Each structure stands twice: as structure tokens, then as C-alpha cells.
Symmetry: C5
Subunit: 103 residues, 5 copies
């Protein structure tokens, strides 16, 4: 069980930590078919997706995907500092696996 986002990120292939230390600049969400996704940007231009859920996801996985989009929305609206994102960087835009907030 990892104790921090970096270690967690390290357990997957084709991941990377972005250290933003900045609030979210823009928040985009879509309910359109095959594109039920969220997209966030930062003032420096970095863009990240929360990928659409699939049939391959069990309920508790689907609740994590939804939770993440919830977290992103509420972080945006409270202007919470995003410390780090763990992303998958073999996708475009980079696909969020995890988030950390601090300060």
C-alpha cells in the first residue's frame, strides 16, 4: 500500500508526476456519448483528462472515477492548490490516475 502519490504513481507503467502547485484554471465536463469525461487545464497550458468509464469497470472502480471528477470540480470551485498529479502519459491529453492537494 503506497504512502504518497509518488509511490502510487510508480506502481504503474507509462506514468509521470506533474508538480503544478497551482489551482485549476478551467474545468470541463461532458455527458455526450463516448465522451463522458472531464478536462482540466492550468494557467501554464497543461491539460489533463479523466478518461470515460468502461464496461470493464466494476461498481467500486466506477465510483472512484466519479469521485475524481467530483474532487476536480470542488477543487476548481474552492481554488484549492493542486500539489501533484499522477498521470498516464501514453494518452493525449495525459490521463489523471491520482491527485494530491496541500498548503
Amino acid at each position: 500500500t503506497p504512502q504518497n502519490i509518488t509511490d502510487l504513481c510508480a506502481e504503474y507503467h507509462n506514468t509521470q508526476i506533474h508538480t503544478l502547485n497551482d489551482k485549476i484554471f478551467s474545468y470541463t465536463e461532458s455527458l455526450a456519448g463516448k465522451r463522458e469525461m472531464a478536462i482540466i487545464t492550468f494557467k501554464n497550458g497543461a491539460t489533463f483528462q479523466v478518461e470515460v468509464p468502461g464496461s470493464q469497470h466494476i461498481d467500486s472502480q466506477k465510483k472512484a472515477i466519479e469521485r475524481m471528477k467530483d474532487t476536480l470540480r470542488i477543487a476548481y470551485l474552492t481554488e484549492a492548490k493542486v500539489e501533484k498529479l499522477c498521470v498516464w502519459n501514453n494518452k493525449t491529453p495525459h490521463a489523471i490516475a491520482a491527485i494530491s492537494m496541500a498548503n
Copy 2:
């Protein structure tokens, strides 16, 4: 994969982008039978719905319909600037497909 709401909107037939750059003037929801919908308006007069959940929306989509109303509700109550809406324009009032916020 889209990196913003305009790219995403352009993937669908019978969609257009509206540019608001304004907070929601009014938020309406109903639990009346076959009208379980949200409706928002902008001071400029524009009116939009979130559609009644129905048989065209698979599970990810019914979830995202529920998330859209959660978003519109919290956006209204925080006076968050709505940047753009992607809508189906083959409905009256136009039906929301995606939202971007970026005050």
C-alpha cells in the same frame, strides 16, 4: 481525444457552442413525472435544459446526467462563470452536452 469543449462539441452532429462568460441567472429542477429535468437561463435570455434520463443514455451517461445537474446546481450557488456550453440545437430548449468554467 478532445483537449477542450470546442473540439469535443465538433465531434457531434446537431451541436453548437454558445459562449456565455457569465454566471447562471436561474436554476430550475423538477421531480414531476416524465419531467425530471434541470433548466438554466442566462441574463441575455438564453435557456438550456439537462434532458430527462431515458433509454438513449447507457449507465455512464445516466451517471453523467446526474453529475451535470450537480454541477449546474453548485455553479449557480457559487456564481461560477460559465465560459461555454456545447448543446444539441435540435431540441427546444437546447440540450446541454458539455460545460466549461474558467472565470
Copy 3:
């Protein structure tokens, strides 16, 4: 498809609009068996229920009834102005069909 709460309200029998243009004065909620409901009041005395889910309600209404109670809770705690309610006025208290917020 209706563009506002008045037009939506006009599609049902035994409904009427109340124009309140006021914040909620009190919010009450219950988990007692067969009284799983909320009740709101306004400073003018007007008193409203979200009904206990029962045999009068179709399936599609059940998520919406839960959503309406969430909306009333957060409206109360944000002191949000309630513009209008659509109610069934053959019930005591009057039973909420829809709500519009504007300010």
C-alpha cells in the same frame, strides 16, 4: 418541452405556482419509518414537503425526489433565494413538484 417552471407546472393537474422570492426559513428532515421526507418553511408561514416516495411516484421520480431534498438542504445553508415553487396543492403540506432559483 418546457422552458420554465410555470410551463412545466401547467402540464400537471392539481398544481399551482407560489412566488416566494425569499430564502428558506427552516429545513426539517426525517428518517423515521414511512416519514422519510423533508419539510421547508418561509418566514410568511408557507410550509412545503418533499413527499415520502410511495405508490403515486413512478421509478424515474425516485432519484429526482432524493435530488430535490439535497437541493433544499444546500439552498437553506447558502441562504439562496427561492424564486418559485410548483406544488401539488391537494396535499398537506403542499407537495413540491419543481423549484426555480434566481436572484
Copy 4:
């Protein structure tokens, strides 16, 4: 159908109204197996539970018990004044049936 917490409470055996007119002093929450419950206190000394969902609870109450723990959490975090609680006084600590907020 009751119009207020007191008349709702009066419909049940082994209940009483507490009149608090105070914010919640503490909020406690457990996920521990067979103690999935919330406990709140007021500065006066008063301790109340939301009961572990159990045999005494009918279907409709399960959702409402979830909502009630939601409401007590956000009441605490918003320093919302609690007016009254309806409780079962044959439980220790006394078990919450209903809550009212005014201020």
C-alpha cells in the same frame, strides 16, 4: 402528514423532542464493521447517534439514514444552528429520527 418535527415525532412510540437551538459541538463518524454510525454532541453535554442500519429499520429508512449523516456532517462544518432533534429515547445514546434547522 405532519407539518413540523414535533408533530412528526409525536406519531411514534418512545420518542421525544430535544430543543437545542445551538450548533453541533462535535461530529464523529465510524466505518468500523457493525458500528457504521455517526455520533454528535452539543456543548450542553448532549450525545446522539445515527444508528447502524439494522433489523429495526425498513427499506425506505436506509437511504434516509445515509442522507441524515450527510446533513449532520455539513451542519457541523457550516456551524448551522440545530433547532430540534426528534430521537428515540430507548437507545443509548439517544437515536436521531429527525432534525430541524432555523436561524
Copy 5:
């Protein structure tokens, strides 16, 4: 039935109270496969998880795990002072069974 986090904690094996009396320093959440978890840290260095939900959890447990992550997120973003945690201390990092807030 316990009246407080300390009494509830003492009912289980392999548990302990941590007394933090401090707001959450960092909040980390993951949507990644088999790492659907939150992790929080305090300034004194203490690091805690909410367990990954899985086939070994009953629904009551699964529900109470999603609630705990809701609680930790909003407690973080409101800078709510955490009084105590009841945790299982045979896990790394220690796994939250219960949280108390007073302040």
C-alpha cells in the same frame, strides 16, 4: 453502543486512538485499478489511508468507506480540525476506522 470515538475504538482488536487536534495537511486520492484510496497526512508526519474497497467488504462496509472519503475531502477543504482518529494499526499506513471533529 459507544458514546465517543475512544469507547468505540476500544471495542476492536488492532486499533488505536491518534489524537491530532489539527487540520489535515495533505489530501491524496487515486482512481487507479486496485488503488482506489485516499491518504491524508498531518504536519506531525502521521500518514493514514482509507482502505481500498474490494470483494472482502460487505455493502455496509463499502458504503461507509465511500462516506469516509467524502468526509476527509470536505474536512481538508474546510480546514476542519480533526480531534482524533481511530485506526487499525496492523496496516501500513494505518487505516482509518473512525474520525472525530470538535473545534
